Design a protein around this ligand. Structure first.
Ligand SMILES: Nc1ncnc2c1ncn2[C@@H]1O[C@H](COP(=O)(O)OP(=O)(O)O)[C@@H](O)[C@H]1O
Ligand SMILES: Nc1ncnc2c1ncn2[C@@H]1O[C@H](COP(=O)(O)OP(=O)(O)O)[C@@H](O)[C@H]1O
Ligand SMILES: [Mg+2]
Ligand SMILES: [Mg+2]
Lengths: 371, 52, 371
């Protein structure tokens, strides 16, 4: 039979059968209970709208993501999300399909063990396998080397790989991602008068960020230009009218990636953690990693980031090496495409964690040889 | 998109039912009463008693 | 058995069995004791004529409404009105019929508790339920969202509802209604010479208001036109002759709704309390409330109000949103039609306040789960 390549993510759940080009169903991972009282009788009001249904009734719900930073903080809601994904968005019972979840690097063990225990006890799948979210993104590019920066919505991690041999001592995981950029944008919008507070209006700020923000090639020059002319002010129409005008908030929101001091984080930007991740590698594979830097994940879709990052790394790196940044147009679904490719391989067909194996060793089987 | 749009009409179908089918509970109230005439035949009394 | 859908109102009591299209008996709610001496013996003169009987002998009575502004100020008279409604206008003993009263929002608790105590002790009904007068008017329109402006004769209230979830923090109750318009019309008629003082002549002024007054589309232009031409002066024949001619009093009486400063009230008109009630709602359901504005209640029957209100709200609201005002021709009985629909539902059949429940918790049961 065919395998189910699910990809929990944090912000958008992407799923679909193995062997295709794009995920079959992509929908936000939010579960929102209603918060008001409700007076109409017999309206058929449910107790929790999940997935894309709660992005249409969000006016009277309190949306809450079940995955904070890679890790899962609310297991009941995550179980509800998985149940919805299997039964309503794909309509395939899990009793007859292997599953291939994905997990960020350096995550707590208990999260992974609980994930496999749920998949084997509640949904009762035949066999499931958990894979690191960066190796898949490297599969999708058709490479076999390269250092991949997978800046998702929950957590940004940077896994270097050479000739198929991952370097476990050079993984640099940073917890700045799309959600913190949404919060920072929502916080700097208040400097013009627009106040978004409700958890429903966070979605509106996210839409503003997606449609308007861009990464500046040079920050100081853009700050000077936006403060003199008015060629940058782009307007946007809220879900009820009252258009708003975003000035130099456009390139200040995604600039937080390269200067995490804006949101008070100490660490260095995504332009310098990649160079540090390279320098921890051996001295003889640094040229190949320099030449095959891969971008993935949703947050790396800002217009103009593949040039800013290349300029920064070229500034840091030695002058002789060639710096090349691979930015495929299908960046958002790169991890899932790689997952489909991996699940479609014949050599991989014996790596699944078969159910009888789980019955013999318990949920701690995932840390064992079947990784 | 078609199924999503059709969902709203399916939900509104119940409201339409409640609006329409329920008025059939009773509609004979329009019927008026007798209000008969005398044709100068209902004059069978004198000025004897008026308190009763 | 069938349920009794009574609707106390203030000015017209509307009642009838559940499941029909129109109330069976509609009659003014006035109780008038005779005031003169009375010399004929054995005429069979009663001590209080209630309902529609006191609108024919009003020449020698002192009519007094038992409901001032939604609240009930004279409980004995209200009990008399209910007794008349049950026994003479419907001729069904209440011992064998559930009842569904209606109550304005934000009313004193003691009023509701006394109402249920009367219905359970004096009339001894099997089960009664109290419902907010605006949710029913939303039922009758066949909608499930929308903000309903129910401008009755006692009190005008504006309850917004979305997807069946009422928003309790956005109810704007204003005490200007048809009765104040009658008093203001009676007060401005004195500018031509016609003086109505007696409580019986208030009914004549009410008839004048119903038959002649209309809401102007633009107030200043109408004031200028009525002051130059004479195309507006419509005449009306009193109950004894001596026709009167109403000039620019025609559109000045119902204009008080949009400018409550005429009768000295501070608050804003019904055109601006609706917009304020909308703006208190969440930012994502404002479009739906804009598109589904519902009118109900008797006082919204003035010829030309559904255009003036739309013009005013379109002036206030953002230019992109579409403003639509639902004004069904059966506006007056909208609340009662909705009450019939609600009482005819199967899902609602277990929400009644059964008598044994009242015996166990006292009259304060109404504020509890059985709302
Ligand atoms: N076109 C875009 N432009 C800018 N940011 C985007 C765009 N699309 C998605 N994002 C950001 O990326 C996030 C989605 O990232 P995604 O790759 O789905 O995370 P995950 O790894 O959990 O699947 C969104 O929250 C959004 O903030
Ligand atoms: N056709 C009409 N034109 C103008 N005003 C009307 C009309 N019919 C009723 N009214 C006003 O509405 C009042 C009746 O309102 P109603 O809806 O019966 O109040 P309630 O909510 O108490 O039932 C009357 O007092 C009258 O002033
Ligand atoms: Mg991801
Ligand atoms: Mg009413």
């Amino acid at each position: 039979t065919t395998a189910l390549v699910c990809d929990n993510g944090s912000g958008l759940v992407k799923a679909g059968f193995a062997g295709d080009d794009a995920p079959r169903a992509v929908f936000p991972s939010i579960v929102g209970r209603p918060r008001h009282q409700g007076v109409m009788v017999g309206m058929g009001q449910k107790d929790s709208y999940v997935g894309d249904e709660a992005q249409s009734k969000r006016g009277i719900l309190t949306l809450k993501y079940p995955i904070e930073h890679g890790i899962i903080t609310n297991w009941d809601d995550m179980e509800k999300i998985w149940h919805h994904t299997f039964y309503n968005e794909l309509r395939v019972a899990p009793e007859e399909h292997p599953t291939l979840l994905t997990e960020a690097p350096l995550n707590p063990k208990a999260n992974r063990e609980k994930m496999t225990q749920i998949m084997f006890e509640t949904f009762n799948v035949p066999a499931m396998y958990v894979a690191i979210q960066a190796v898949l993104s490297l599969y999708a590019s058709g490479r076999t080397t390269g250092i991949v920066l997978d800046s998702g919505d929950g957590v940004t991690h940077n896994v270097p790989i050479y000739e198929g041999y991952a370097l476990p001592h050079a993984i640099m995981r940073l917890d700045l991602a799309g959600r913190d950029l949404t919060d920072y944008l929502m916080k700097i919008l208040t400097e013009r008068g627009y106040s978004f507070v409700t958890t429903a209006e966070r979605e509106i700020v996210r839409d503003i960020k997606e449609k308007l923000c861009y990464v500046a090639l040079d920050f100081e020059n853009e700050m000077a230009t936006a403060a003199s002319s008015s060629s940058l002010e782009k307007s946007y129409e809220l879900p009820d009218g009252q258009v708003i005008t975003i000035g130099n908030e456009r390139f200040r929101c995604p600039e937080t990636l390269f200067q995490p001091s804006f949101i008070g984080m100490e660490s260095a930007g995504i332009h310098e953690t990649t160079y540090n991740s390279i320098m921890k590698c051996d001295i003889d594979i640094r040229k190949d990693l320099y030449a095959n830097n891969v971008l993935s994940g949703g947050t790396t879709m800002y217009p103009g980031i593949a040039d800013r990052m290349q300029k920064e790394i070229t500034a840091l790196a030695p002058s002789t090496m060639k710096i090349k940044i691979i930015a495929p147009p299908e960046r958002k679904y790169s991890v899932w495409i790689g997952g489909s490719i991996l699940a479609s391989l014949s050599t991989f067909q014996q790596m699944w964690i078969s159910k009888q194996e789980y019955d013999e060793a318990g949920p701690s089987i995932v840390h064992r040889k079947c990784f | 998109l078609g199924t999503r749009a059709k969902e709203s009409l399916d939900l509104r179908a119940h409201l339409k039912q409640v609006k329409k089918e329920d008025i059939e509970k009773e509609n004979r109230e329009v019927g008026d009463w007798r209000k008969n005439i005398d044709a100068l035949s209902g004059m069978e009394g004198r000025k004897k008693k008026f308190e009763g």
